[PDB]
Amino acid sequence: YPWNNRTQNTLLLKDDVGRSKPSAYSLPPVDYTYGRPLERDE
Amino acid sequence: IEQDYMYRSQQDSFKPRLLPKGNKASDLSYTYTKQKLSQIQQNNNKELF
Amino acid sequence: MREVISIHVGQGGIQVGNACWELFCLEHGIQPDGQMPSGDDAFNTFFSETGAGKHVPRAVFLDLEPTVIDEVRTGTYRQLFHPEQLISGKEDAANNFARGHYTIGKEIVDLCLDRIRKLADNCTGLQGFLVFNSVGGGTGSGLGSLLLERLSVDYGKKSKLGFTIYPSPQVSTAVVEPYNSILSTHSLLEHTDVAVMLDNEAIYDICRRNLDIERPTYTNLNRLIAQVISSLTASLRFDGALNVDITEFQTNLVPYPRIHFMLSSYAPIISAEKAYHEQLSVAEITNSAFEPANMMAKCDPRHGKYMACSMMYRGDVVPKDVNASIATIKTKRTIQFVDWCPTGFKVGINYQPPTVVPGGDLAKVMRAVCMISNSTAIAEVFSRLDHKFDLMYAKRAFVHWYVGEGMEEGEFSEAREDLAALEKDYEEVGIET
Amino acid sequence: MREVISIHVGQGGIQVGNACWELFCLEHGIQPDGQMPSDDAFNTFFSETGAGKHVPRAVFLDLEPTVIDEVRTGTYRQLFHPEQLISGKEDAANNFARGHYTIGKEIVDLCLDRIRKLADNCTGLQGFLVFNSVGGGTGSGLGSLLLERLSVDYGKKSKLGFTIYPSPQVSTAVVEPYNSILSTHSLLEHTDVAVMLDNEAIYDICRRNLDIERPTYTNLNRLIAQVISSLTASLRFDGALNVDITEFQTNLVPYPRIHFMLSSYAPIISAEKAYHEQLSVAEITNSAFEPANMMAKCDPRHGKYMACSMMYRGDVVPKDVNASIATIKTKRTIQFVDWCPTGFKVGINYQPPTVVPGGDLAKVMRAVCMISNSTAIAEVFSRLDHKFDLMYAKRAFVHWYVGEGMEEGEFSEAREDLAALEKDYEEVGIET
Amino acid sequence: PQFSNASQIEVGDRSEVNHRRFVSQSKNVYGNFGKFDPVSNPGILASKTKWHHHLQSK
Amino acid sequence: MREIVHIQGGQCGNQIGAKFWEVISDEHGIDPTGTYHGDSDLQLERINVYYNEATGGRYVPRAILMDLEPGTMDSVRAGPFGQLFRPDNFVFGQTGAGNNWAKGHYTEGAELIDSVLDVVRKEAEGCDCLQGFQITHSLGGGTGSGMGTLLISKVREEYPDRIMETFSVVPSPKVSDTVVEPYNATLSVHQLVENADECMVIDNEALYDICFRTLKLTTPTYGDLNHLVSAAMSGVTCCLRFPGQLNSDLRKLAVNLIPFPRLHFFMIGFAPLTSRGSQQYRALTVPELTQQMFDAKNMMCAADPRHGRYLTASALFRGRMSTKEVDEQMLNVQNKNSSYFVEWIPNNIKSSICDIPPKGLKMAVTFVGNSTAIQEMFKRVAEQFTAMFRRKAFLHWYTGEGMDEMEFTEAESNMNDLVSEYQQYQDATA
Amino acid sequence: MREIVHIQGGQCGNQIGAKFWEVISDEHGIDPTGTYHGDSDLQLERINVYYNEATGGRYVPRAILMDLEPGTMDSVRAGPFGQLFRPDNFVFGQTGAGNNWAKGHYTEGAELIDSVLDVVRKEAEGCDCLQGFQITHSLGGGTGSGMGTLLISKVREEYPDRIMETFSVVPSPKVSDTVVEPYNATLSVHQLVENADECMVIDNEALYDICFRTLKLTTPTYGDLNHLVSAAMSGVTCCLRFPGQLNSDLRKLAVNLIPFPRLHFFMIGFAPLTSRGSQQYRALTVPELTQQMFDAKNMMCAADPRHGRYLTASALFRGRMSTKEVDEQMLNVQNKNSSYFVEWIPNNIKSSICDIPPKGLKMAVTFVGNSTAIQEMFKRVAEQFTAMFRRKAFLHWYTGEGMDEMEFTEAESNMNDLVSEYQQYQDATA
Numbered sequence A: 001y002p003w004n005n006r007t008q009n010t011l012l013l014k015d016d017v018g019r020s021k022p023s024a025y026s027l028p029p030v031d032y033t034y035g036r037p038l039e040r041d042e
Numbered sequence B: 001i002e003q004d005y006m007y008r009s010q011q012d013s014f015k016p017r018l019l020p021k022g023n024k025a026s027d028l029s030y031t032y033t034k035q036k037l038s039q040i041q042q043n044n045n046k047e048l049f
Numbered sequence C: 001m002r003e004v005i006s007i008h009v010g011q012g013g014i015q016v017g018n019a020c021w022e023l024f025c026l027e028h029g030i031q032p033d034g035q036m037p038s039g040d041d042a043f044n045t046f047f048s049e050t051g052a053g054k055h056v057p058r059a060v061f062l063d064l065e066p067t068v069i070d071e072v073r074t075g076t077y078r079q080l081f082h083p084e085q086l087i088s089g090k091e092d093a094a095n096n097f098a099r100g101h102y103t104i105g106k107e108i109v110d111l112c113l114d115r116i117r118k119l120a121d122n123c124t125g126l127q128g129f130l131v132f133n134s135v136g137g138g139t140g141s142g143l144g145s146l147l148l149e150r151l152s153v154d155y156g157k158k159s160k161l162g163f164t165i166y167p168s169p170q171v172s173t174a175v176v177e178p179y180n181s182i183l184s185t186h187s188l189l190e191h192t193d194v195a196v197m198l199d200n201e202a203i204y205d206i207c208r209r210n211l212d213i214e215r216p217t218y219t220n221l222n223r224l225i226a227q228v229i230s231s232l233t234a235s236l237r238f239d240g241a242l243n244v245d246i247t248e249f250q251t252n253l254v255p256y257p258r259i260h261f262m263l264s265s266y267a268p269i270i271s272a273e274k275a276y277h278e279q280l281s282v283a284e285i286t287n288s289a290f291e292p293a294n295m296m297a298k299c300d301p302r303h304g305k306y307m308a309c310s311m312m313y314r315g316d317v318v319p320k321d322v323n324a325s326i327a328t329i330k331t332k333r334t335i336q337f338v339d340w341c342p343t344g345f346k347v348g349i350n351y352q353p354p355t356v357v358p359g360g361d362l363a364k365v366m367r368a369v370c371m372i373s374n375s376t377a378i379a380e381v382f383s384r385l386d387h388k389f390d391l392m393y394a395k396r397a398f399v400h401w402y403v404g405e406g407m408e409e410g411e412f413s414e415a416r417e418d419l420a421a422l423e424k425d426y427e428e429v430g431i432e433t
Numbered sequence D: 001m002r003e004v005i006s007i008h009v010g011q012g013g014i015q016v017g018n019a020c021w022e023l024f025c026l027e028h029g030i031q032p033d034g035q036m037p038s039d040d041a042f043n044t045f046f047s048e049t050g051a052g053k054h055v056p057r058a059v060f061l062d063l064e065p066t067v068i069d070e071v072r073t074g075t076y077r078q079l080f081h082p083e084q085l086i087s088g089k090e091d092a093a094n095n096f097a098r099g100h101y102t103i104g105k106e107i108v109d110l111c112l113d114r115i116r117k118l119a120d121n122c123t124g125l126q127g128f129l130v131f132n133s134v135g136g137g138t139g140s141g142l143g144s145l146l147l148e149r150l151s152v153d154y155g156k157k158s159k160l161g162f163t164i165y166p167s168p169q170v171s172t173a174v175v176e177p178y179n180s181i182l183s184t185h186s187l188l189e190h191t192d193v194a195v196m197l198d199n200e201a202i203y204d205i206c207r208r209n210l211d212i213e214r215p216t217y218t219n220l221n222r223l224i225a226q227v228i229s230s231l232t233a234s235l236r237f238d239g240a241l242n243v244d245i246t247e248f249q250t251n252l253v254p255y256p257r258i259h260f261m262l263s264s265y266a267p268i269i270s271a272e273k274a275y276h277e278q279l280s281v282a283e284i285t286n287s288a289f290e291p292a293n294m295m296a297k298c299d300p301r302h303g304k305y306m307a308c309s310m311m312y313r314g315d316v317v318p319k320d321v322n323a324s325i326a327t328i329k330t331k332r333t334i335q336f337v338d339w340c341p342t343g344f345k346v347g348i349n350y351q352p353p354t355v356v357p358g359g360d361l362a363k364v365m366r367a368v369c370m371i372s373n374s375t376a377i378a379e380v381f382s383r384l385d386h387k388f389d390l391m392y393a394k395r396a397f398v399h400w401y402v403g404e405g406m407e408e409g410e411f412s413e414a415r416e417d418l419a420a421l422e423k424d425y426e427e428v429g430i431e432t
Numbered sequence E: 001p002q003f004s005n006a007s008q009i010e011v012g013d014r015s016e017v018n019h020r021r022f023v024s025q026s027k028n029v030y031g032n033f034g035k036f037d038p039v040s041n042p043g044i045l046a047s048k049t050k051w052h053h054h055l056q057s058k
Numbered sequence F, G: 001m002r003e004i005v006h007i008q009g010g011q012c013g014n015q016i017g018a019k020f021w022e023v024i025s026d027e028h029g030i031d032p033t034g035t036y037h038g039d040s041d042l043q044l045e046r047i048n049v050y051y052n053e054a055t056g057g058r059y060v061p062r063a064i065l066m067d068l069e070p071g072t073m074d075s076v077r078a079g080p081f082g083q084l085f086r087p088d089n090f091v092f093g094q095t096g097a098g099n100n101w102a103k104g105h106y107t108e109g110a111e112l113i114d115s116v117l118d119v120v121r122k123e124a125e126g127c128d129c130l131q132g133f134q135i136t137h138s139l140g141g142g143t144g145s146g147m148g149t150l151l152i153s154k155v156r157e158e159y160p161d162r163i164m165e166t167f168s169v170v171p172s173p174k175v176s177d178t179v180v181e182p183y184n185a186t187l188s189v190h191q192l193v194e195n196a197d198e199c200m201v202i203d204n205e206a207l208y209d210i211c212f213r214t215l216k217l218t219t220p221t222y223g224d225l226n227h228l229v230s231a232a233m234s235g236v237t238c239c240l241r242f243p244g245q246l247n248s249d250l251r252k253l254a255v256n257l258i259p260f261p262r263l264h265f266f267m268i269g270f271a272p273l274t275s276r277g278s279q280q281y282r283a284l285t286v287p288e289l290t291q292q293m294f295d296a297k298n299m300m301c302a303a304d305p306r307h308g309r310y311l312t313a314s315a316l317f318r319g320r321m322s323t324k325e326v327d328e329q330m331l332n333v334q335n336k337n338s339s340y341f342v343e344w345i346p347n348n349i350k351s352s353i354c355d356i357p358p359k360g361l362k363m364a365v366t367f368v369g370n371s372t373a374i375q376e377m378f379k380r381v382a383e384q385f386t387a388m389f390r391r392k393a394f395l396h397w398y399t400g401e402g403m404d405e406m407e408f409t410e411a412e413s414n415m416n417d418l419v420s421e422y423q424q425y426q427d428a429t430a
Ligand SMILES: Nc1nc2c(ncn2[C@@H]2O[C@H](COP(=O)(O)OP(=O)(O)OP(=O)(O)O)[C@@H](O)[C@H]2O)c(=O)[nH]1
Pocket: C009, C010, C011, C012, C015, C016, C065, C092, C093, C094, C095, C096, C133, C134, C135, C136, C137, C138, C139, C140, C141, C165, C172, C173, C174, C177, C200, C218, C219, C221, C222, F245, F246, F247
């Protein structure tokens, strides 16, 4: 799998071009609620 | 270049099978022993003529 | 019953409007074909019911070179628009202000204003107009100026909002942009209630730093602009604790009739990687909204005082946290306001969370801030464009092609003196009593 | 409500930071991904992501990306925020001029931006930690620049300098006296308190107590991390006698100039198989003041003591503490200066030290970490002064410093600064 | 005659299998944490840590 | 809508036109029979730019072929793609030119031009919305150098507002294939300088040098050279026929390129150009595209731009790449070669992007430049002119057909002028 | 990141590079076709230091081959690993230099160097952040000894800040292949002393002694010597490409090895060197490695390092080990050989470590020592030069190509000044 710019080993090996970055760590799947919720006063 | 890399990668992805069962006298004697131990009972079952 | 008419003229205007309408249709739920998916009545700001089923956007597309018009008509949005309002010319003005303002634009502004009148007749509670064009293009500048001067006498007191992209100091595509820019600013200095600063290198640095994109194209820039516009205009179509309409923009951002040029900012702008690790609280997000690198224009606010700042919070922001954050900004010393303005902050709140296009680069965030600031430091762009104009006009380069179109020699001189008047007005306002 | 930020600069700083942070995550139970599997003390060193993991309050600065991407590819990639691992371009290559006037200014501004948008998050700043090895170019230069900037950016906020000073005779560098003296001149008046952490003393400790003939830098960093954890456990754990970071520099610093202390830790016990013992409080505190047990190669018996503060962790009893102190002050081998009738500060913490699995230390129910200000510290300054004088006698290696934006006079200023420091140390210890 | 350079010093002894060649010491010491069940027996802990150190060395 | 007609005359111009039409047909996927067998729908959206529709679905070029001899016509007719042209557009005389500018432009040209003017005005009336004209000709011959400028003037008086470009092959002393270059060349350029809107100059010596060193061809041929120049000229109208991020048509190029009315001579170039072997080891990136296109090696003329300062430069990139990377590459190169650019015009580089790369290539750039370098060619040709004119050699032939030396004197005076006020801006400072 | 570009010239440098690229490709898992076939991920993060990316994923060296005889080029291309090089990087003359330093430095070298300057500037601009240049050559030749030194002079002129290092195969008198060696060696060293930031000398006599003694191989060859030098030259850049406890790049080595700006000549060695029929036993622990280090007869130079006092030393260990044995052994060497180390620079040894051992070894080391011993080689070279120069033998060709006795007399005066000022530091006391 680890040939040149297809798969993930590290950022140097990913070596992205064009539009964006390939995701690295795990990331939440699609539509996670990022950051704190708020407005609890009970 | 791309096809050669595909071939090399798909071949490198396959290796880790050892499963040692060298078997000449070990398996010959195993067959003999299992045959004896199994067919003793089948000898002591037969309906007499 | 609130509605606004949007005009996209020029290549930059059309390309920005494409992303703008993608964002609006996705935000309101309408499919590209226009049909309602399998009422709330919140689309009246930007769409009009056809009577049964689909909806029609309140936009007019105009340009003299039909490439982008053909692209739109062959794209996935063939069914959305009104096949008659997408007016396309025959030959492009070729970055010549006189060609667009005197030669070919004259027989197109007639049908353009006819379409505007037709839309306004259907409109009932019309709030105003949005105009989208680039200043570094001759046709864009000339036809924008002609259309605005026509509207100023056809309608009069109705508000106009100008989203014009001024050239950057170092990075630019043409060779004659400054001539067009100075002529267009001469034309629009006294015709629009507001103007926004949207130079390209600022958003380039923005996307290289925060989004950390390496070679983004115009699509990302237009998407960011669309995000800004949607954040600005969500208050007219969504319920909020602090409802704000367009009338409370020039009310609070125009201290004197001449001073009406602002610069914008938006936050947060974070990919999925870095927002997974960071707080996204109101205080920090508004602190980042004011830092020297997130403005939409290349200006140094530490080189001038502030006049008026208005920001809209969109999401679930709490007014108490807003007030605490504003107090912290006041106690901050690196930011200073003009003496005759004790309070200059206009905060707005909306409950509707930000929306993200699928396949985009932005991450879904439950708080957002759109900031519009008028400050004394904006004079630097006028100074640099004036200096560049003097550099070319020293030996009258490229003048004769404008002259041969019918153009007279003196408008360069009077635009120069008008820009001098504008800069001296800014300097006189910026002084302490 | 109490937060502290640590700054790591230099290769040695990064390596020691790796060890200290793995120690903290082990101690708090945060599995290296950050997510807690299956309180509120972690707020001292970590910040909640909101739902799930935690983020350390540290920034890593280094001009050579080798250590940085080693960290980013190691097993601890999951932990840190991707944009706080700030990597420069050119390592200073043991050149103070490069790290302080040449290429450090293009990174110090971004570092200060990171500092501000980290500190604004917190509210209860007692102070900051700084890790650096003075025997290097980039670490020393960037640390000095950062301290000089922060002294005016924040002012009264506390700073803790855990510098790595050169060893008395072993060395991996050859031009390290120059950067050491320059950084000492910079740091004399820019930090609140600093510690001595020379490598030779720790080498002696690990060969003597651990009975290991194969120690490397990993053991060094693990011992230093244990020292840091013992120092900082009082901020996040209940103890019979709590102590704050602000309770340190108002007690160990008699005069503003003298703020360089030296540490010790006990009992450092190997895990071979034995029962060892129960490690009585009296005997462990006796071992703590053993001159050869000191974490720095400074002989206390050659000088006088100004102050001593020790912290016990475990199930230590104050009566045992006081009896042990009575015995130590009864002992004649160590003496105090006349104008200090008492010089002891004591801290107690209920939390026993945490043992790192796969490490060298074994689990123990008592431990003590001691930090002392003593007069005999002047010897290392004197020997480094002779070190630098032998080199500057004929202006060796001076020319590349001169040609990289450095003027020539400042060596004399550093020399006279060390002269003033040694004279102050000599005169403070004189009998009234 | 053999053409060109045709070196044969062979500085590497070769034919050894050092499968633990590219293992970084920093990572392998700082993040192994293998086995070590929560047993309170000093002898058991000592045996396990001795075996762990032997593996780290080899 | 948005179309340009093509007229070719003389041997060299006819060959340029034939190879250009073959290249365009291959690019748009049209077989020699005139039927369409392309794949992309976008390949046919603006087929009307260069072609006209006929009964049955066939496409025909809007080209006109003219000369005084039928050898070129019936040579190109039997060649590949030779049946595209409508036969009624072939106009040819029978007297020949004799490489005599006066004889071509005065004795037979006046009587012959009626048919070609009629057919070109018919095409201009028939076309939807004409923008300009394009003419391919050589300055070293008689027939081309005469009737080219003749048709230029004749088109001009009734189209003063439409734009017009001439791909003119200039003669050079290293490669001289005739003995009467200076006379006819200066006579033609005398009227080109006052009537032409754009003129791109091409040098055979430069073509030979580029195909020898960069291309590393063993046996270069006229067909190969014609293909090179055809590709270079086809690259100009990339965004005019295909969509692009930053559209820039011919009039946009004109307005961005012309600072003064009489300065409309340009040098062009194409990239990437790789040899047979090195292309295997090569990669494709915008930095190396920019480096190759800004190499004075890649220029199509013997003039060396390192000996002068650029007035205006332009680059038509084609393929899918982001705008900024290109644009700050232009910024960096302008900063690095600031002394080689005119100082009182900031940001004198034009960038345009088209989204349809050439067939077989991922991306390609066409460079156009107007710089003080071309004064060397004018000085050289003027020196040859005055050397040949001092002894009045070859002059009696011209003078025997109603010619006289006075307009020769004004032609040389105008050339000396052009040189003087073209060097004037080189040392001009703000 | 912080890559270094390779430039080699002359037959000596060409053969040196032919084996350097072999060793580097073997270390990094690259075949003759530029195809990666490694196993670990650590082989690729820093591969950009020596290689550039091409389409399809191939890595190609950033090496520039320069010479005057095409024979070396087509000999080295036909060999293995010759396809890695880009043909555009080959630059060679057609007339040769004939071991004439004057002809190579004044007549033909200046004429030819323009193209190689263009290509080296192209590479230096292409690289993201230039770290330095590294050169390999010999002073026993003419073309190398001239054009190298000229190239160093000029590239230092353009890049006065970036570090640079050169390796010099200096001639030896006992085994000498030219009577012109003193002349061109003196001229080239005079040129190099004020230009090269680092210079590292190699002696074929010492190489022969090593391969005869410690390898116990009966028949050495130039390939074998090139392999030895390539191993040493690969060892120096270990931690620059691979992680370790204490990374120490070329700039670090330069800072720590040179006391005074005019003293930048180095002698080196490698360890361990075992016999070909080495029995399988034990392992190379630190004590024997550091003893074989400081065996003075292990050095790759004919100079006897115990004849003088070491100004400084440097060790690059390769493999996984602790630093305690490192520094204690270095102090032990210091204390046992305190006579060989000058006293006013106490603790004068660089220690650096890399975690990835050489292929087929568990532990290895490269030693680079700056010692007062090289003065004898300079003394003998100067003696031979003045003996040959007193009666002006072979001088007339050197005078026939534009220069005179002034250059020779100033060069020998500078050489004597260098030797004298190098010797006063030997007997200087603290
Ligand atoms: N933000 C943004 N600006 C653009 C985009 N495309 C073009 N521009 C700007 O538009 C300016 C020039 O105008 P054009 O886009 O070419 O179109 P125009 O203003 O109508 O003028 P013409 O080209 O003659 O049609 C350039 O300086 C660009 O900065 C885009 O996609 N996004």
